[PDB]
């Protein structure tokens, strides 16, 4: 029923809702993340990446609905959601709301008899291109054939039987587990990804829909299977990967957890060494191990301790092939849970030399066990916004002028980062391949991100209406329980001096967008308003007439 209009990528655009024959738009104060998540699910577009206010995909025409959608979040249709007519707002079409959903992938098969076979093409940065044969597996093929409604995947032939194509190769590495129902639901990396030999391109043959798509396997009674395909209730089924890493801050690090007898469980760190970790990292397509961690380094598990005294020599393609003590009944506690850090683990930081700054510094990436600088070549404002969103700031920032210093000191990891529309992390952005080399500050990137809190419409930047950035868009704070202790937190976070006032009742003017917080009840010693007790993320009965303000002293 709902439609997205005016987007550049699929599953994006301005939100439009029909009643009767009349389409209308929704004001950016009326449409929550929960309502956005119901729309993305209903439209088969995955999950919500961004809620965007301010007529980002252009202003609409005609009707604007006066209704708020009070979705719980798990409704199947937007029509099932409770609707509250709010008082008749000052919303024009310059505040029509918009949504980026997660299934923005543009992928197809070209030059076979049907769309059920051919060379894989991916559209990135307005341009169709191939994928590398070495970057594409059978798990990826099963997901794509289900997406194209073409049954199951038969083959991934390497010798280009449908033509190499007259075009570019994207170096993207999909890491589908095999149980996903759209390529947009799979984890994917493009950052630093290696080139492949010319014309070594990926191809898929699907079965067609004369076979139905396999369901995921649901059983953990037996020893886990090392094949993609298992047998369950007289039907073939895709093995859901019964190994995960948790609490590592990424796909290729964290505590090793294993699914058996209906429960996720941990591994004891006795005899847990690098060879064991290598097998884990191989099985997850995470490269090689750089660390086998013990001593509950990423935290302690909730569930049984299934495996102990695992002694892989490193041959094995799965941890289930390794010699252990078998399932359950071991003489150790969760203070010794095992984990890994693998060579494909990626992390991101800004480093200030003398500190004081929170959203500013030299951009650095962690890869293959090492930190290194990100080069500044080709780097657009939109790429800096993705960086700044990923580091926990607002989605905008500025690159400092290049240093005159042409003499090499630090290691660089990657350069030529060029983010497309849609990802909110740097890892799905194409670049040059990883190359550890020495580099001068001439080549390095210093970033000043916009903070996720600001004061608008006063005589300094330390005085005005409180606005907070969350989930895509700037929004406001309601003034119920908003006191001087809240203002002392806002002033401290901005790096202003003493709080003078906690203003109420839209004293510097009403804002736009959603109202992200109400019932903010700070102790008063917090370093950020995100540490404060509040009714978080858009559940409020307020309007923009009740917007909160802070006035602080400079310096
Ligand atoms: C297996 O795949 C094929 C191919 O499907 C298409 O390609 C894949 C890659 C996907 O993208 C998929 O979404 C595509 O559709 C499926 O064949 C298609 O099947 C659909 C559904 O049955 C057909 O639509 C119609 O059935 O067409 C009927 C009219 O058929 C005449 O006209 C067609 C051209 O328009 C001719 O191809 C056909 O030979 C006839 O001469 C029409 O009666 C149907 O409409 C009625 O029912 C719908 C609800 O389903 C209702 O909304 C309407 O009001 C109406 O009452 C319907 O339009 C496709 O024409 C057909 N495409 C091709 C290329 O053959 C196949 O269904 C699928 N099998 C399974 C098990 O899923
Ligand atoms: C993961 O492995 C690396 C490599 O051994 C560890 O880095 C070293 O840490 C020790 C002690 O902290 C230092 O003496 C070495 O100089 C470091 N070497 C290198 C090459 O970086 C790292 O500490 C390990 N991390 C975890 C969590 O186990
Ligand atoms: C602000 O003050 C509160 C006091 O209520 C500090 O809260 C403590 O948090 C830890 C969490 O590990 C508790 O174990 C302590 O018992 C709490 N109270 C005290 C008195 O320490 C809070 O950490 C303070 N924050 C800042 C940034 O100063
Ligand atoms: C496993 O469970 C899922 C979700 O309940 C279901 O859709 C699927 O058909 C099941 N598959 C098998 C082989 O039992
Ligand atoms: C406000 O403006 C001054 C002018 O240079 C700037 O230095 C300062 O960092 C700004 N403060 C905030 C909280 O934006």
Swiss-Prot record:
Subcellular location: Cell membrane
Induction: Suppressed when monocytes are differentiated towards dendritic cells by CSF1 and IL4.
Residue stretches making up the SRCR domain: 2-102, 107-207, 243-343, 348-450, 453-553
Distribution of this protein across tissues and organs: Expressed in monocytes and macrophages. Detected only in one population of monocytes (CD163+) which is in advanced maturation stage.
Residues with attached carbohydrate: 461
PTM field: A soluble form (sCD163) is produced by proteolytic shedding which can be induced by lipopolysaccharide, phorbol ester and Fc region of immunoglobulin gamma. This cleavage is dependent on protein kinase C and tyrosine kinases and can be blocked by protease inhibitors. The shedding is inhibited by the tissue inhibitor of metalloproteinase TIMP3, and thus probably induced by membrane-bound metalloproteinases ADAMs. Phosphorylated.
Disulfide bonds: 27-91, 40-101, 71-81, 132-196, 145-206, 176-186, 268-332, 281-342, 312-322, 388-449, 419-429, 478-542, 491-552, 522-532
Tree of life domain: Eukaryota
Oligomer and partners: Interacts with CSNK2B.
Entry's free-text remark on domains: The SRCR domain 3 mediates calcium-sensitive interaction with hemoglobin/haptoglobin complexes.
Role: Involved in clearance and endocytosis of hemoglobin/haptoglobin complexes by macrophages and may thereby protect tissues from free hemoglobin-mediated oxidative damage. May play a role in the uptake and recycling of iron, via endocytosis of hemoglobin/haptoglobin and subsequent breakdown of heme. Binds hemoglobin/haptoglobin complexes in a calcium-dependent and pH-dependent manner. Induces a cascade of intracellular signals that involves tyrosine kinase-dependent calcium mobilization, inositol triphosphate production and secretion of IL6 and CSF1.
The protein, known as: Scavenger receptor cysteine-rich type 1 protein M130
Organism of derivation: Sus scrofa (Pig)
């Amino acid at each position: 029923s709902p439609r997205l209009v005016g987007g550049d990528i699929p599953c994006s655009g301005r939100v439009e809702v029909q009643h009767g024959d009349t389409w209308g738009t929704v004001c950016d104060s009326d449409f929550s993340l929960e309502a956005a998540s119901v729309l993305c699910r209903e439209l088969q577009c995955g999950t919500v990446v961004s809620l965007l206010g301010g007529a980002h995909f252009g202003e609409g025409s005609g009707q604007i609905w006066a209704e708020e959608f009070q979705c719980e979040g798990h409704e199947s249709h937007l029509s099932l959601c409770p609707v509250a007519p709010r008082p008749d707002g000052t919303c024009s079409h310059s505040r029509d709301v918009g949504v980026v959903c997660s299934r923005y992938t543009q992928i197809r098969l070209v030059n076979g008899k049907t769309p059920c076979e051919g060379r894989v093409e991916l559209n990135i940065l307005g341009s169709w291109g191939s994928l590398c044969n070495s970057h594409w597996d059978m798990e990826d093929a099963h997901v794509l054939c289900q997406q194209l409604k073409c049954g199951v995947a038969l083959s991934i032939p390497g010798g280009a039987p449908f033509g190499k194509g007259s075009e570019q190769v994207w170096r993207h590495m999909f890491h589908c587990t095999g149980t996903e129902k759209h390529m947009g639901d799979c984890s994917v990396t493009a950052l630093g990804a290696s080139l492949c030999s010319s014309g070594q391109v990926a191809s898929v043959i699907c079965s067609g829909n004369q076979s139905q798509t396999l369901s995921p396997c649901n059983s953990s009674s037996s020893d886990p299977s090392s094949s993609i395909i298992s047998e369950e209730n007289g039907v073939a089924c895709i093995g859901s990967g019964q190994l995960r890493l948790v609490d590592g801050g990424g796909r290729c690090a964290g505590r090793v957890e294993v699914y058996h007898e209906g429960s996720w469980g941990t591994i004891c760190d006795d005899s847990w060494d690098l060879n064991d970790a290598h097998v884990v990292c191989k099985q997850l397509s995470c490269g090689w191990a750089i660390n086998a961690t013990g001593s509950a380094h990423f935290g302690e598990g909730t569930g049984p301790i299934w495996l102990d005294e695992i002694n892989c020599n490193g041959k094995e393609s799965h941890i289930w092939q390794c010699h252990s003590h078998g399932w359950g009944r071991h003489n150790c506690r969760h203070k010794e849970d095992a984990g890994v850090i693998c060579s494909e683990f990626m992390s991101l930081r800004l480093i200030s030399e003398n500190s004081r700054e929170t959203c500013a510094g030299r951009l650095e990436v962690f890869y293959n066990g090492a930190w290194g600088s990100v080069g500044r070549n080709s780097m657009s404002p939109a790429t800096v916004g993705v960086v700044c969103r990923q580091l926990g700031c607002a989605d905008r920032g500025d690159i400092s002028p290049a240093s005159s210093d042409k003499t090499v000191s630090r290691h660089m990891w990657v350069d030529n980062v060029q983010c497309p529309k849609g990802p909110d992390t740097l890892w799905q952005c194409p670049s040059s391949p990883w190359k550890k080399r020495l580099a001068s500050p001439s080549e390095e990137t210093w970033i000043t991100c916009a903070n996720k809190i600001r004061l608008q419409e006063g005589n300094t930047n330390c005085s005005g209406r409180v606005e907070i950035w969350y989930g895509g868009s700037w929004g406001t704070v309601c003034d119920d329980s908003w006191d001087l202790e809240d203002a002392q937190v806002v002033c401290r976070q901005l790096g202003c001096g003493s709080a003078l006032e906690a203003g109420k009742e839209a004293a510097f003017g009403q804002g736009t967008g959603p109202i992200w917080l109400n019932e903010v009840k700070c102790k008063g010693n917090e370093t950020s308003l995100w540490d404060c007790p509040a009714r978080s993320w858009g559940h409020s009965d307020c309007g923009h007439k009740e917007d909160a303000a802070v006035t602080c002293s400079t310096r």
